[PDB]
Subunit: 388 residues, 4 copies
C-alpha cells in the first residue's frame, strides 16, 4: 500500500510471552526437514514468517554430514510459515547465498543474499522477488551482513555490511536502499571498533542496531541510524552486564566507547532493546559457550556504565544449547506501540554434540507483554541419541 | 465483514450424519503425521478446519516416545484442512501451548494458548494471527481452558478458564473478549461445583457450555452465558442419564444443582445440545473407560431429573476407543437454523494400548440431520500391531 | 458467477489426445501416495482436478493390506491437482463415504458421498463445501451412485442412484438437485432393466448417461435426461459392438431395449459419447477381464442395431490392466463446442496381481481432437515386483 | 492484463550473478524429489518458476532404474517454485509428454507437450491451462521442440519444432501461435542446415534463438524471428569460439553459413545472447563431454568469423558435470532493459556415473549484472556414493 513509517515508540516490556517455536530438530528426526542455521523472524503486513540459511539437505539425509561449515554453494535464504519447521515442501527460497538480511517496507519485501568464495563474494539485492542491485566485495574477505531482519522507514531500508578481517579492523558500510536500489552508503563512523551481524529494530523514526564486535569486545557495539537524514552514530553498550559470548565475568563498570577486554576473536550474534528504563538485554547464561539464554532489564544500559539488572527472565536453561539471537517486530500490528520481539537459535549437533556429523538448529521466539508473566524455559527438545 | 450474531435457533436433530474423519493414525503409520490429542473443529466464514494440540513430533518418530504426557514445551495448537490428517506439511500453528480454545467472530479469528510450568502458566490471546493480550495464572495451579471452540456474538467471545485444584474447589473465570481484548471477566457463579474443559455452542443470543466436573460429578455442569449482558448462570444436567466418564451406573433420578456422586477426581471432556425436546447427550458407552460413544435424545435433560432416552445413535462401538468430545457449528452456513455438530477424539496408544510408547488420536465428526438416517460405527481403524 | 447452461454441442471427435496421467502407483512406490479406486475427473470454472475414493492409507503403508474391499469407514472422496498423484499432503477431502459423484454448476460445487452398512446407508449432499441434504437408503441394500461426475444445467444437477439387488431388479432413482436441495426425484423409467454407475455428459440442454447393467446386459443401458423438464428416458445402446466386461463376443446385431445376454451378475463402469455419426464407444479389449482399453467410432451406435466400427484408437494395450472409465468435459473452456473427455482407471494389485496385499490404481485421461492424431498406449507403468 | 510487447533492449552484461539453484539431487537423496531432465526457467508476470520433464518416479524410488531413457509414457512437463526442488508434493503438471516448451504472453501461459511413439508423435498446445490445438507428426520421426521457454510479442508466440532425422536433413517448422491457436507456420529457411532444441529470448520486437545442429555443426545455428511479420532468417554463429558439445578445438576463423565440421551426429542444447559488443556465449568447458560450463563475452560473435573472447566467467568447473543450458528473461521486471538470464542443467547419474541406475539433474541459474562481480563455481553438490 504505502511505505511504513516508524511512527510508534516501544511498548513497555514487563515480561516476555511465547510467540513461536518450530521444534524443527525433534520433528526432523522423522520428516523432511532442511538443515539450517542463522535463523530469524520477519513480518509482512499480513503475515510473519521464520527465515534461515538452508544447507541444501535434510537432517536425516546423508548430505547433512559436514553442515558445521558456514559457506557453501548449497546454502540459500529460505522462509516458511510461523512455527512450522523448515521442510523441503514448505520452504520458500528468497535468494541463494550464505549470509543474508530481509525486510518489508510496507509495499513489498527486500531480501539480500551474499555468495561467492572468500575473496570474491557479492551481494544481490532482491525487491518484489526480483533481483535489482548487486554489490561486489570491497575488501575481498568474506563480505557479510546481518543474519536478521533489516528495518525500513518511508521506503528507506538501511543494512549493515562488513568486509574484511574478523580479528582486526574491517570495512563496515551502511547502505541505504529504497526499492532495492542504492540511495547512499557510508563507512562506519563513531567509536564501535569492529562490527558484525547487526540485530536491528525501529521506533519513532530511529533504527537501533546491536551488533557483534568479534575482534575485541565482550560488550556489544551499537549503531543508531537516522533513515531520513541517512546518517548514523556508533558506540558500545555502557553497562557492565556484558552480553557477547564467550566473555569475561561481569565487572562493576563497563565501557561506553571501546571494547570491554578479556576475550578476542570470537563472539555470537545478539541483540538488545535500548529504551531508557525500558531497556532489556539478551545474553547466553554461560560466559564460555552458547549455553542458556536470559533477558535482563538493565535500565539505561546504553548510557550508564554502572547499570545492573532490576528484573529478568530465563528463556533457555544453562543446561540447554542456545546460539544466535536477534530482534524483529510486527510493524503492522494494531495498537499504539511496537511490541518488542526476539528469537533465539537453538543449535544442535556440532561442535558441541559431535556424536552426529551435522549441525542444525530449531527456533524459539518471544514478544513483550505489559503484564508480569510467569516464566518457563524453552529448549530445543530433541534427543541426539535418537539420531545415532 | 460484520460480526456474526447468533440469530438462529438449532435445527431439529432427528439423527446424525458423517461430517468429517481424518483416519490420522492409519495414515500416519507410513506418512509424516504429527502426534496430537485434545482435538476439535471450528469454522471460519469460508472454511471449517480440524484443530488439535500437537506434541511436536511425528507418530513414527522416535520422539513419539512419552507423548502420553500432557504439558511440554513442544506442544502447539495447530489447524489443518477438514478431514485431512495433521501432517508436518499441512498443519498451521495458531499458537504455542498445552491448553487452548479458538473461534471466529465473523471478521477474524481469536486463538488462545496457555503455556508454562504448573505454578506459573499464562494465556496469550491472539487475534487476526497476532498476539494481543496475556493473562497470568491467578491460582498458580495449571491455568487451563476449553480444548474446543469458543463462540462469539456481535464481537464478544466468552471463554471459560479454570486455575486451581482438579480435586477440590478451583477458581473458574469467564472472560469476555472482543478483538482479543478483555472487556470483562467474572468468577464462576451458580451451583456447578467444579468446571473444566467446557464445550460450547450458541443459538438465539445465548451461549451454552457443557463442561466437566472433575472433582465430584458424573452428571455434567452447564454454564449458560448471555454475551450481551456478559453474565452467566451454572447448574448441572438434571437427567439421570449420566454423561461423564468414569461414572456409576445410571440411576432413575439425577441431580440438578449438585454433582451426582459415585466417582471422584476424574472425568472426560464432553458435550450436549440442550434445547427442550430437541435435546441430545453424548457419552462413552463404557462407564469405566473411554470406550465407545453414543448420542442419546433425552428430552428436557437439563431441567428434568427423571428424563430418559427416547431415541439414540451409536457413533463408536464399545469395542473401540473413544476419548474427548465437543461441540461446534458452522455459524456461516445457509438456511434458517444452526446445524448442531460434534467431534469425538479416538485415542490410540497409551495408556490403554501400551505395546507402543506413544499416545495420539484421530478424529471423527458428525452433524445433525432432520432425516432419520441409518447408523454406522466409526472407529479409528488403525492396527496397533503394525506399529510394533 | 451465473449457473452454467449446456448451450453447446460436442466438438467433432476425429481422435483422442493425452489430457492427464498421474503415474500414481509408480510414484507411490516411494512417496506418500494414498491407496484409491473409483477415480474420475471434474472441472470447476477455473480448474480441472482428479477425484477418487481414498482407502485411508498410503500404498506402502501396512494398512494397504486388504484394500481390495469396497466399503469401509476409512474411505472418502478426495480431489487433487490435475495429473499429480493423490498424496496425503495434496488431497482435499470432499466428503466421507464409499460411493460418490460431484459436479460444478457454474457457481459452486455439489459433492455427494454415501456411507454406512449395507442395510442402512445414507447419502449426504454437500454444496459450497457444506452439508445441505441427506437421503436415507430406500431399499436397504447398498445405496450407491455414479462414481464419476454429474452434470448441471441452469442450477439443476441430476444424479442417478441405485438401491437394491446387483443381480436382479433394483430401485433406481433420478434426483434433481439445485443448490444441494432436492427439487424432485423420479423412479427409473424406460427399457433399461438394471442401472449402476452412470457416466454422464451434457450438450444442447440434454444430459446423456451411459451406465452398467450388472444383472444381465453386456450392452450398456443409456439414460437421457431433460434437466429443464426434469424427465428422462432409458434404453440400451443398440449396436452389436458390446461394451461392458466381462461380455460375450460381439454379434452382428445388438439389442435396443433389452440386455444383450451371455454374462450375468457382473460388469464394469464405462461410458460413451452418442452423437449421431460422431459416436464413440469405450471398452476393455478383453471380453473376459479388465484388460486393455480402446475407443471405437461406431456411427449411430445408440439407434442402429447393426452398427460396427469405422475408426478406432487403442488407449491401453490388452497386455496392461485397465478398469473403470467415465466421461467428463470442461464446460468452461473457450470455443463453440464442448470437447469430449474421458478417464480410464488403471487398477493394480488384487485380484489380478495378488503377490501384493493391496488394490489401487492410477489414472490416464484423454480429450478429443478434430485432428486425426497418431496413437500411443498408456499403461500404469509400475513394476509390481518392486513392491514385494 | 494486456499482451506483453518486447519493447526493451538487453541490459549491458558485465558479469553474471546467482539467480536460482535447487540442489535437487542433494536434497532428493532423502526426500520425495522427482527424477527429471531437460529443465528450464520461465516467468509469469507475478512469478518465475523452474520447469522440467519429470520421469514419473522419485530418485530414491525403485522406478528410477532406467531413467536414462528419453521418451516414455511416464514423463510430463512440470513446474515448481523458484529454487525449490521438483518434489511430488510441489510440482504442478503443465501437460503430458517427453518434449516441451512454455511461455507467458502477458495475459496467460501457453504450454506445449509432445508425446507418442517415434513414428506417430503429436503436440498438444495448452493455453490458460486448457488444451486448445493439436498438431500431428509431419515427418513421423520424433516430433520434438525447444526444451526451454518460447517468447511472445503482442500475443504472438513463435515456437520451433523439428520432425525427421537427427543425422541428416530434417523438417523444421516455425509455428506462430496466439491464444494457443495456429496463426501461421513456415518451413525453416536460411543457411542453418539442421535445427534442434532452440533457446530463445526477445528484445526490441525481435526474437533470437540459438539452437543445436545435431547433424554436422559444432558452431550453433541461429534463427531470428520477426513476430509481427511472422517471418524469420537463419544462419550460424560466425565466431571461431565453438559452443556445441562434443566439438573440435577452437579454430581461428569460424563459419557463418555452414556447420563448422569435426563432429557429427551429436550435440547439446545451448544458448547465447547476440547483441553486438554485448554478446555472450555459453558453453561446456570440455570439448568431449558435458563437463563444466563457462560464459564468454565474444563481441559480434554472430557476424564476425574471427571474433574471440574479451572477458569471461566460469559457471561450473570442468571437474563437475553440466548438461543442457538455455535462455529466459523476466519480461515483467522493472527498469528500462531486459536482464539476460540462463540456466544450466547439472546432470547426475547415467551415463557418466553408472554406479547408480538412474539419470537426473539439478538446476543452477544466473542473470546478468551491470557490475563486474566476483565469480564462484556452482556444482550440483551431491555425492553419488551416498546413493549406492
Ligand atoms: C514465576 O515467574 C516469575 C516471572 O518470571 C518469577 O519471578 C522472576 O524471578 C526471577 C528469578 O529470581 C527474576 O529474575 C532475576 O531478577 C534479578 C533482579 O531482581 C532483583 O534485583 C533488583 C535490584 O535491586 C530488585 O529490585 C528485585 O526485587 C530482585 O531482588 C536479577 O538480578 C537476576 O539476574 C541475575 O541472576 C541470574 C541467576 O538467577 C543470572 O543468570 C543473571 O545473569 C543475573 O546475575 C548475574 O549478573 C549480575 C549482573 O552483572 C551479577 O551481579 C550476578 O552476580 C550474576 O553474575 C554471574 O552470572 C552471569 C551469568 O551467568 C555471568 O555473566 C557473570 O559473570 C557472573 O558469573 C534475575 O534476572 C525476575 O525478575 C522475576 N520476575 C518477576 C516479575 O518477579 C517467579 O520466580 C516464578 N515463580 C516461581 C514460584 O517459580
Ligand atoms: C438402521 O439405522 C437406524 C437408525 O439408527 C436404527 O434404528 C435405531 O436403533 C437404535 C438401537 O435400537 C435406537 O437407539 C436406541 O433407542 C432407545 C430409545 O428408543 C426406545 O425407547 C423409547 C422410549 O419409550 C421408545 O419410544 C422407542 O420406540 C424405543 O423403544 C434407547 O433407549 C437406546 O439406548 C439405550 O440402550 C443402549 C444399548 O442399546 C445403551 O447403550 C444406551 O445408553 C441406552 O441404555 C442405557 O441407558 C438407559 C438410560 O439410563 C438405561 O435405562 C439402560 O438400562 C442402559 O443403561 C445401561 O447402559 C449404559 C451405557 O452403557 C450405562 O451407562 C448404564 O449404567 C447401564 O449399564 C438406544 O439409543 C435408535 O433410536 C433407532 N433410531 C431410529 C430412527 O429408529 C436401525 O436399528 C438400523 N437398522 C438395522 C436393520 O440395523
Ligand atoms: C499412427 O496412428 C494412427 C492413428 O491412430 C494409426 O491409424 C489407426 O489404426 C488403427 C488400427 O488399424 C485404426 O483402428 C482400427 O479401425 C478399424 C476401423 O477402420 C477400418 O474399417 C472401416 C470400415 O469399413 C474402414 O473404413 C477403414 O478404412 C478401416 O479398414 C476398426 O475396425 C478396428 O477395431 C477393430 O479391430 C481391433 C483390433 O485391431 C479390435 O480391438 C476392435 O475391437 C475392433 O475389432 C473387434 O470388433 C469388431 C466389431 O464387433 C469385430 O468385427 C472384430 O472381429 C473384432 O472383434 C473381436 O475383438 C473384440 C475386442 O477384443 C471382441 O470384443 C470381439 O468379441 C471379437 O473377439 C480399429 O479400431 C484407426 O481407425 C486408425 N486411425 C486412423 C486415423 O487412420 C496408424 O496405424 C499409426 N501408424 C503406425 C505406423 O502405427
Ligand atoms: C574475482 O572474480 C573476477 C570476476 O570473475 C575474476 O576475474 C575474471 O578472471 C577470469 C579468468 O582469468 C577472466 O576470464 C577469462 O577472460 C579472458 C579474456 O580476458 C583476457 O583477454 C582480453 C583480450 O585481449 C584482455 O582484454 C583481458 O585483459 C584478458 O587478458 C578469456 O580469454 C578467458 O577464456 C579463455 O580461457 C579459459 C581458461 O581460463 C577457457 O576455458 C576459455 O574457453 C578461453 O580460452 C579458450 O578459448 C579461446 C578462444 O578460442 C582460446 O584462444 C584458448 O586457447 C582456449 O581454448 C582452449 O580451451 C577451450 C575450452 O576448453 C577449448 O574449447 C579450445 O578448443 C581450446 O582447447 C576467460 O574467460 C574474466 O574476464 C575476469 N573478469 C574480470 C571482470 O576481470 C578474478 O580473477 C577473481 N579474483 C580472484 C582473486 O580469483
Ligand atoms: C559469513 C559467515 O561465514 N558467517 C558466520 C560467522 C562469522 O564466521 C563470524 O561473524 C566471524 N567473522 O560465524 C558464525 C558463528 O556461528 O559464529 C556463523 C556464520 N555463518
Ligand atoms: C491442562 C491439562 O493438562 N489438561 C489435561 C486434562 C486435565 O489433567 C484434567 O482436566 C484434570 N484437571 O486431562 C486430560 C485427560 O485426558 O484427562 C487431558 C488434558 N491434556
Ligand atoms: C458401492 C460399491 O461397493 N460399489 C462397487 C461396485 C459394485 O459392487 C457393483 O456395482 C455391483 N453392485 O463394484 C466395483 C467393481 O470394481 O466392480 C467397485 C465399487 N466399489
Ligand atoms: C525428443 C528427445 O528424445 N530429445 C532428446 C534429445 C535428442 O535425442 C537429440 O536432440 C538428438 N535428436 O537428446 C537429449 C540429449 O541429452 O542429448 C535429450 C532429449 N531428451
Ligand atoms: C509514510 O510517510 C510518508 C510521508 O512522507 C507518506 O508518503 C506515507 O503515506 C506514510 N505511510 C503511511 C502508511 O501513512
Ligand atoms: C450483528 O449485530 C450488530 C447490531 O448490533 C450489527 O452491528 C452487525 O452488523 C450484525 N451482524 C450482521 C452480520 O448483520
Ligand atoms: C443460464 O440460463 C439462465 C436463463 O434461464 C440465466 O439465468 C443464466 O444467466 C444463464 N447462464 C449464463 C452463464 O449465461
Ligand atoms: C502491446 O502492443 C499492442 C499495440 O499493438 C497493445 O494492444 C498492447 O496494449 C501493448 N501491451 C502493453 C502491455 O502495453
Ligand atoms: C535395473 O535394471 C536392470 C535392467 O533390467 C537390471 O539388470 C538391474 O538389476 C536393475 N537394478 C536395480 C537396482 O533394479
Ligand atoms: Ca566479541
Ligand atoms: Ca467427573
Ligand atoms: Ca519418508
Ligand atoms: Ca453387465
Ligand atoms: Ca553438433
Amino acid at each position: 500500500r504505502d511505505f511504513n513509517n516508524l511512527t510508534k515508540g516501544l511498548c513497555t516490556i514487563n515480561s516476555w510471552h511465547i510467540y513461536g517455536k518450530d521444534n524443527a530438530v525433534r520433528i526432523g528426526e522423522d520428516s523432511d526437514v532442511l538443515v539450517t542455521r542463522e535463523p530469524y523472524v520477519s513480518c509482512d503486513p499480513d503475515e510473519c514468517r521464520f527465515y534461515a540459511l538452508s544447507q541444501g539437505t535434510t537432517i536425516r539425509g546423508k548430505h547433512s554430514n559436514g553442515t558445521i561449515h558456514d559457506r557453501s554453494q548449497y546454502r540459500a535464504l529460505i522462509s516458511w510459515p510461523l512455527s512450522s519447521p523448515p521442510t523441503v515442501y514448505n520452504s520458500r527460497v528468497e535468494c541463494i547465498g550464505w549470509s543474508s538480511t530481509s525486510c518489508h517496507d510496507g509495499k513489498t519485501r527486500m531480501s539480500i543474499c551474499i555468495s561467492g568464495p572468500n575473496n570474491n563474494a557479492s551481494a544481490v539485492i532482491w525487491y518484489n522477488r526480483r533481483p535489482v542491485t548487486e554489490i561486489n566485495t570491497w575488501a575481498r574477505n568474506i563480505l557479510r551482513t546481518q543474519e536478521s531482519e533489516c528495518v525500513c522507514h518511508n521506503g528507506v531500508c538501511p543494512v549493515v555490511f562488513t568486509d574484511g578481517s574478523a580479528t582486526g579492523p574491517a570495512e563496515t558500510r551502511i547502505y541505504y536502499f529504497k526499492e532495492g536500489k542504492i540511495l547512499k552508503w557510508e563507512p562506519l563512523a563513531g567509536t564501535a571498533k569492529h562490527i558484525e551481524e547487526c540485530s536491528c529494530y525501529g521506533e519513532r523514526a530511529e533504527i537501533t542496531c546491536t551488533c557483534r564486535d568479534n575482534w575485541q569486545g565482550s560488550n556489544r557495539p551499537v549503531i543508531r541510524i537516522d533513515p531520513v537524514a541517512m546518517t548514523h552514530t556508533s558506540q558500545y553498550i555502557c553497562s557492565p552486564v556484558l552480553t557477547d559470548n564467550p566473555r569475561p565475568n561481569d565487572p562493576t563498570v563497563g565501557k561506553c566507547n571501546d571494547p570491554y577486554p578479556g576475550n578476542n576473536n570470537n563472539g555470537v550474534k545478539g541483540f538488545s532493546y535500548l529504551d531508557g528504563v525500558n531497556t532489556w538485554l539478551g545474553r547466553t547464561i554461560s560466559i564460555a559457550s552458547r549455553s542458556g539464554y536470559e533477558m535482563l532489564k538493565v535500565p539505561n544500559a546504553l548510557t550508564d556504565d554502572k547499570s545492573k539488572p532490576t528484573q529478568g527472565q530465563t528463556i533457555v536453561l544453562n543446561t540447554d544449547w542456545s546460539g544466535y539471537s536477534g530482534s524483529f517486530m510486527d510493524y503492522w500490528a494494531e495498537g499504539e506501540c511496537y511490541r518488542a520481539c526476539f528469537y533465539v537459535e537453538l543449535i544442535r549437533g556440532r561442535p558441541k554434540e559431535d556424536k552426529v556429523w551435522w549441525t542444525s538448529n530449531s527456533i524459539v521466539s518471544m514478544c513483550s507483554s505489559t503484564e508480569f508473566l510467569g516464566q518457563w524455559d524453552w529448549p530445543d527438545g530433541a534427543k541426539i541419541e535418537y539420531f545415532l
